[PDB]
Design a protein around this ligand. Structure first.
Ligand code: CLA
Ligand SMILES: CC(=O)O[C@H]1CC(C)(C)C(=C=C/C(C)=C/C=C/C(C)=C/C=C/C=C(C)/C=C/C=C(\C)C(=O)C[C@@]23O[C@]2(C)C[C@@H](O)CC3(C)C)[C@](C)(O)C1
Lengths: 179, 162, 220, 155, 176, 170, 168, 176, 172, 169, 169
């Protein structure tokens, strides 16, 4: 919300540097998107930490197609090695959450998820502002980290486990790009 | 600090260095505590060397391993041949004394009064200057015992007989 | 209702560096080096001295003194670092013992010369860079709101360190401030190209310019 | 305005009173025109896509250099999109998703995204009777392409 | 208040230098140095237990130097066996934490996190855990300097000394 | 309160029998059975998940009868493959639970334990988790019933229905 | 108050000696002893479980005496296998617990650590848990005393009483 | 005063650039630079005479580099043969002299000493020797640069140029 | 004019003990001791330079001891190599110096000699040389101590330490 | 005051020609010649002592002419053994001295220097040293003339004489 | 003044015969004689050191008498070894000094030379140096007479008085 200043954290303050908030109604739409994108990109960022560490399940993701869990690439193409009969199960469940259980039309983002004594907001309102800002800030840092992880695989051809094994962390002197 | 326990008829308030040239009672009461603390240890240490240097021992078997008291040498070599299970008990019990039962818990009459109302061998039957005379005796007897036990420790490593 | 920075893009005076782009109202012209260059609008979101604690984390309105503090300390390092990227390749290197190892100071590639010299060479450089930053905080903590950016108390005016005299005119002192800031902004771009060419070529800049300003052996 | 009831010259049967039984959002006429126009616009670029792929304008080059799939290997029939890799089909549906929400948002039921008719990069604005005449020809050619696909995908 | 924290039962308000009644202006930072030195030494003491228990991660900390994590010693020479480009990455991040995230110019040690996130609303329970941080921090300052000095005197790390049973300093070969 | 606890979003106060208006006083008894049947069936669904994941206790359940823990089937015949002296220990210890300890005559539901030891302070947060126990208990009531029916109408356990690829009944 | 802190349903107050009417000034220490005897016996009987389940520390207790951790018996004489400096380290450390840190003369039983760190501020919830610390302590006192006499009368430890069929 | 100290008989006040009236405020440093350059070049001419008379210190400059004092060239490559750890000692000592002891920011050159420790109290005699120091500094400034270009244009030190009889210009000379 | 005679640049007045504010009456002796300790140590650092450069007197110091000037060590043990009949001749002559000729009870430090026989009439020029004698005296006190400490910390004299390349602190 | 500087004790003011009480306007140039003839002759008597004591400059005076410093005579023919390119370097440098640096037209005598670079600050001991420069100049003008007369009469230098014992006429 | 020039601290006005009031007008001669005897004796003491360090002039004192400088003994029999044509040269040049140049009838003592050519302007520094010349003259007067009787009572010069260790009384 604007009045308690939830997104405005102490390095930059109200960081709207290009002047996009000209209305209080267009802030609630943008914060509903920013918090939703941050919640998605945080689980996407924990994915690439688990996937590129090689931590996989044991067995077959698809025994009908013979696809083990270790056969899936740990990069940006691993989601689409999953069979679409199995990918339809992910979209159906995640779409059922988006319409019924955690309806994404709710622009507040509050879906009643309270883990009681770890957020006792009525006694500690400073913990409310600490956890509300840290949902946005971790979501903002993971939004740019997943654009980090996506484009670093595009411009190098290697995923994060392969480009770190090679030490390829400089776009200078390599055979890629015009630099 | 010119008329106290340390002021003596041969040297009244000697103090050559720059220690207590102010009205700091809290700095004097710390330094008076440690001088009485070093003295009460070095008094037992002067006897505790000369008992072992005379060859006197407890009647034997410091451990069940088969080590007598006479097998343990005297001087600085005593700490090397004491069994280490009993060397812990010496440090643990002295630490038990120095943490719990050696302090001015209930509040004594002076610095070094450790009678907590638990042990008292008199101290009421005195002339109230014999109290200060007996206190100034154990300060100066503790004074000479520090220079005493330092002489026995510097001349054991030197080898000079005393 | 509206953003505090959307109101600075509503006034939006004409610019000089980007004369087609209408610089925001927070560049008042009253600062040194104000050329109307803020296309992303960082001056509309001014920053405070966050290093002093939580009480200093919030920035005052219309105060770019800590953006200018970070601009000067980046540019002052970048000026010394252009020479440090160059001068081992020009004026030779330093000799080593068998303790530090011979050829320890001799890596003419400046980036892997960081990992070639002993750690005590870099620890003492970092601790001397640390010592003047302790001096900067003790100046910032003392002066507070009356602290001008880039002041480490070196030079002309009040009780600053001046072993060279350096008593400039009070209007020749403001062109020295402008000469410093324009060299700060230039050497920041120059030290980026020095760092990026040392990775792309693998050698120093004198071994890269000197091999390009010479004729090839088949052509001579 | 492109949402009037006067474009396609009329008239046809049901009026769909089942639409307002319990799903009353879909009973709005203004969305049914937005659906008919959008099914029309997708059908018209699909029969041209049927003509380009069946005339073997295959492409110059590879489609996937890693998988080794050239453009000449994908079929010309109705199994064309489902034979390209799913990592490539994802990028198609993702870019449609930016169109479907940000650039040409389908919540805007008018269908007018400010593009004009024939001229890219500056809109060719139609003014009067011919503006309303080109609107129904978009629908009428949109309807012929909708019935033309089911005629060309059953066999 | 701050000036009654750090004074627990067996010593009370313990200042043999007397700098509380002599320099009351310098206490508000000297508490912050004590709390920071404590918190640093508590993570340092816990680290020496983890290092000498041979809990290492896997693989190479520096594959260019061909330097495994297990190749790093578990004693004083451990942090200096890290290559200089790796040591610069730690100090750059720890300077980011100690100036921006947890700025050490903030002298009350209060950085928005509580004790496991929570504020201790009971004032006598908050003062008890504020003393427990100081006392464990003061005990760990002696523990880390007693682990650093006793390594460089006996010459062995905390694992090699314990493997060897070199616990008694009176029957070994040392001074005295 | 108590009557506003089985009303989540979609169906609301759903009862196609009229028994909230026929017997208004025979509700606290029926809610206590609904909560107890939910708590039993929730632990039984997680039980069938642990059994058919072959997490076993690595020993002998009855060495006198000579059967290991990895010898009882992971389906409907699990309690049947237990010796009657072991069932007598289960039925008698839970007699102390159902009568002497946390009883079933206590229709209020809360004995002393709360939600992970504590009490939920916010009443709207507390009434939310009370619907969650009811909904998850209601879903596991249908869940454990369809795990046993799909076993006895197949002849395979939950592990064997999945490993053999026999999932679709058509 | 500590007077109602130990009463539950199926016994209530239950004083066959009647020592709450007679000498009621000694209740404040007898509660502190029952809480102390309870807390020791609970830690003694969950330790009897992990001893006879062989969860040993896989090393040497005393390499100077060549005592592996598995060499110690898991029954009544396991406390006697600890050597001289071993039992001295326990007596030295718990003198710093029983007199200094959690001083056992403090009859409140309250040393500022709470129940897993928290102050149970609900007085009905807090009085329930202290009935549990007493009741589970009472049942462990009879538990740890029914385990010593089940070992010294049969000879075997608990791991050998169960791996014999010697229960009934 | 300082503006009358550089003028002597055959030229008097000599500035072709005319900066004595154009820049009258920059004179007070420009005198100090001329005096500093003169003092440096006078020691450089006398050193050049001493090096080429083969007056060596009879030892080893760098025994680690096996570098005797007589192994150093007596020309313009003299300090190019000093090892770099030896130039560091020269720069560190004259950092202490050029910044602290006799600081070059003192723009009158009047640090502590007189003329052989004497303060010349006669002002017409003191101005005479102040004129001599400037004039001998101006002569040695031309004298050291003509010495330096005569070596690099002949490839010979001043001892070798007077060994071969190479005083006559093979290039083109200019001398008094 | 003795309070300002040790005051120079960067330190200015330096008294961390604060004895100029505690004992203003004992300064006249304490200056005369610092000047005397400076004059003794200035003639001592020059002494170790002469001895370690092997400038000897070309003969026999004690022909009764068959002792040459070149047989005496050039380090801290050089005063011990002198026989005590010769060490008595040193103390007998400096008793005539320090009590009678230039008496050390004279707390001025001022005797009939000046600075190379010259009294300096300019007071700032005279105080410049008096500051130099104190400062070179102070630097030679720390010089003669760092020469005797670093000798016994290595066992070699200054001639043998420099010949072995033992300048850098390896062992310490 | 240059008018009593030449007059010393044992003869007082000495003028057998009477040219102090004759022309008084020619005195300040005749004093300037007597002082200049003195200073040239004093450096010549010292020069005859150094040459006849065989103190030479240890090298070749003219390696083109194969002249060592030991080959130059120590009598009156020493200046004539110098090559003609060496006598010109003496001629052109002392033109710079006699006309520009220490200009001989200056009849007062004091060019820039004093008694070892300093004024004597005292009118009765500076006049005493001005008396010494003239009197030691006068005894050296006769001394260099007597050194050159007996050089050409005997035909020997002052080292060949004192090796033969020629001390009586 | 000249009457306070001989006094020092450890004796003061040391007139044991009381002749400062017995012959007050004869002080000016006796001071001039004490200064004259001291100046001769200090040159005599330094001379005995240079003779007995065998610093010789490296040549012949008299080739007609075949007498090198090394052929002269260092001690008392050194002026006896000088030929009588050389002692006539010493008494002729020092008749010009003692009568004409620095006449010994001049009782003031200061001739045209100063202390190393310099007058001492400070009267407390000039009188101090005047006291040193008298005191070092007094110490060398008994010093040179203690070197003559160390040879005429021993028969041995100062060199091998130190070589043979014969300084033991
Ligand atoms: C201890 C060594 C010593 C010292 C300190 C002195 C000191 C002095 N000598 Mg003496 N002298 C010495 C040994 C010493 N002498 C010896 C060994 C000889 C024999 C070589 C002489 C032969 C000598 C002569 C011939 C004369 C002195 C004169 C002087 C005085 C010069 C003061 C002055 O400026 O006059 C005042 C200055 C002027 C009148 C103008 C001159 C400028 C000064 C007291 C001068 C003097 O007159 O004595 C009193 C002098 O003429 N000395
Ligand atoms: C106490 C008192 O009264 O005050 C004093 C002190 C005071 C104030 C300082 C005064 C002054 C002025 C002074 C002393 C001025 C002195 C100036 C001085 C000493 C000027 C040297 C020039 C030499 C040159 C230019 C060399 C050229 C170059 C040469 C010679 C060569 O290159 C050739 C050569 O080298 C080689 C190549 C090879 C060798 O094998 C051979 C030689 C050597 C031939 C006073 C007034 O006088 C008196």
């Amino acid at each position: 919300e604007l009045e308690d200043g939830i997104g405005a954290v102490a390095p930059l303050g109200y960081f709207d540097p290009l002047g996009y908030i000209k209305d209080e109604e267009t802030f609630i739409r943008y914060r509903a998107v920013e918090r939703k994108h941050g919640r998605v990109a945080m689980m996407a960022m924990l994915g690439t930490f688990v996937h590129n560490n090689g931590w996989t399940f044991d067995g077959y993701l698809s025994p009908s197609q013979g696809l083990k869990f270790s056969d899936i690439d740990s990069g940006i193409g691993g989601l689409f090695q999953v069979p679409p009969a199995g990918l339809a199960q992910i979209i159906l469940l995640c779409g059922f959450v988006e319409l019924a259980w955690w309806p994404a039309s709710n622009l507040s983002g509050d879906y009643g998820v309270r883990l009681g004594t770890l957020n006792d907001w009525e006694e500690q309102p400073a913990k409310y502002y600490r956890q509300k800002n840290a949902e946005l800030n971790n979501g903002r840092a993971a939004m740019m980290g997943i654009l980090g992880t996506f484009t670093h695989e595009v411009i190098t051809g290697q995923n994060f486990a392969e480009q770190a094994a090679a030490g390829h962390f400089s776009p200078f002197g390599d055979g890629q790009g015009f630099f | 600090f010119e008329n106290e326990l340390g002021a003596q008829p041969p040297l009244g308030f000697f103090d050559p260095l720059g220690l207590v040239e102010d009205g700091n009672q809290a700095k004097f009461d710390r330094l008076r505590y440690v001088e009485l603390k070093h003295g009460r240890i070095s008094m037992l240490a002067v006897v505790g060397y000369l008992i072992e240097k005379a060859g006197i021992r407890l009647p034997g078997n410091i451990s069940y391993d088969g080590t007598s008291f006479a097998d343990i040498p005297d001087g600085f070599a005593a700490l090397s041949k004491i069994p280490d299970a009993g060397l812990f008990q010496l440090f643990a019990f002295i630490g038990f004394l120095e943490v719990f039962v050696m302090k001015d818990i209930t509040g004594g009459e002076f610095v070094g009064d450790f009678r907590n109302g638990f042990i008292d061998f008199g101290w009421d039957s005195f002339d109230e200057e014999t109290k200060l005379k007996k206190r100034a005796i154990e300060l100066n007897q503790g004074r000479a015992a520090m220079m005493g036990i330092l002489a026995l420790m510097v001349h054991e490593k030197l080898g000079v007989s005393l | 209702g509206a953003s505090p920075s959307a109101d600075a893009w509503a006034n939006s005076i004409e610019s000089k560096a980007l004369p087609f782009a209408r610089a925001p109202a927070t560049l008042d012209g009253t600062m040194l080096g104000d050329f109307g260059f803020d296309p992303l609008g960082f001056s509309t979101v001014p920053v405070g001295p966050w290093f002093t604690g939580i009480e200093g984390r919030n920035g005052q309105i219309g105060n770019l003194n800590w953006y200018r503090e970070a601009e000067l300390i980046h540019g002052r390092i970048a000026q010394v670092a252009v020479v440090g990227f160059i001068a081992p390749g020009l004026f030779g290197t330093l000799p080593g013992n068998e303790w530090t190892g011979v050829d320890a100071y001799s890596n003419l590639n400046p980036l892997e010369a960081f990992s070639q010299v002993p750690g005590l060479a870099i620890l003492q450089i970092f601790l001397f860079m640390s010592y003047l930053e302790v001096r900067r905080i003790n100046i910032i903590k003392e002066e507070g709101e009356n602290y001008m950016p880039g002041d480490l108390r070196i030079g002309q005016g009040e009780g600053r360190w001046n072993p060279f005299g350096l008593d400039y005119s009070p209007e020749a002192y403001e062109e020295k401030r402008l000469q410093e800031l324009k060299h700060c902004r230039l050497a920041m771009i120059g030290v980026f190209g020095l760092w990026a060419q040392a990775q792309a070529s693998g050698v120093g800049v004198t071994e890269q310019i000197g091999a390009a300003l010479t004729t090839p052996d088949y052509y001579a | 305005e492109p949402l009037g009831l006067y474009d396609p010259l009329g008239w046809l049967d049901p009026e769909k009173d089942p639409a307002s039984k319990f799903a009353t959002f879909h009973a709005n006429f203004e969305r049914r025109r937005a659906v008919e126009r959008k099914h029309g616009r997708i059908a018209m670029v699909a029969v041209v896509g049927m003509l380009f792929h069946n005339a073997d304008i295959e492409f110059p080059g590879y489609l996937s250099k890693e998988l080794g799939i050239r453009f000449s290997d994908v079929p010309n029939g109705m199994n064309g999109l489902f034979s390209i890799p799913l990592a490539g089909l994802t990028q198609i549906v993702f870019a449609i998703g930016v169109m479907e929400l940000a650039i040409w948002p389908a919540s805007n039921y008018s269908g007018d995204y400010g593009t004009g008719y024939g001229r890219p990069f500056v809109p060719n604005v139609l003014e009067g009777d011919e503006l309303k005449y080109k609107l129904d020809m978009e629908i009428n050619q949109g309807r012929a392409a909708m019935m033309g696909i089911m005629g060309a995908l059953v066999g | 208040s701050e000036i009654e924290l750090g004074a627990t039962e067996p010593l009370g308000v313990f200042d043999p230098l007397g700098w509380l009644e002599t320099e009351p202006e310098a206490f508000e930072r000297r508490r912050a140095v004590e709390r920071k030195h404590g918190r640093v030494a508590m993570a340092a003491v816990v680290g020496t237990i983890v290092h000498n228990n041979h809990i290492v991660f896997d693989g190479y900390i520096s594959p260019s130097n061909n330097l495994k994590f297990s190749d790093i010693p578990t004693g004083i020479d451990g942090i200096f066996s890290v290559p200089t480009a790796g040591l610069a990455q730690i100090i750059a991040f720890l300077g980011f934490v100690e100036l921006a995230w947890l700025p050490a110019s903030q002298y009350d040690g209060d950085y928005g996190v509580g004790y496991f996130g929570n504020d201790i609303l009971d004032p006598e329970e908050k003062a008890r855990k504020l003393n427990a941080e100081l006392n464990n921090g003061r005990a760990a300052m002696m523990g880390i300097m007693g682990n650093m000095v006793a390594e460089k005197i006996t010459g062995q790390t905390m694992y090699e000394q314990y493997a060897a049973g070199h616990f008694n300093p009176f029957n070994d070969g040392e001074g005295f | 309160s108590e009557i506003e606890l089985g009303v989540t979003e979609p169906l609301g106060v759903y009862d196609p029998l009229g028994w909230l208006e026929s017997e208004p006083e025979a509700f606290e008894r029926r809610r206590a059975v609904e909560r107890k049947h939910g708590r039993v069936a929730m632990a039984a669904v997680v039980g069938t998940i642990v059994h058919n994941n072959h997490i076993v206790f690595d020993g002998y359940l009855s060495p006198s009868n000579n059967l290991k823990f990895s010898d009882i089937p992971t389906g409907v015949d699990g309690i049947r493959a237990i010796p009657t002296a072991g069932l007598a220990q289960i039925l008698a210890f839970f007699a102390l639970v159902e009568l002497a300890w946390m009883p079933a005559s206590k229709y209020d539901g809360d004995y002393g334990v709360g939600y992970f030891g504590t009490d939920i302070k916010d009443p709207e947060e507390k009434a939310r988790k009370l619907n969650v126990e009811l909904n998850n208990g209601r879903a596991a009531m249908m869940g454990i019933m369809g795990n046993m029916v799909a076993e006895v109408l197949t002849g395979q356990t939950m592990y064997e229905q999945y490993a053999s690829g026999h999932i679709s009944p058509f």
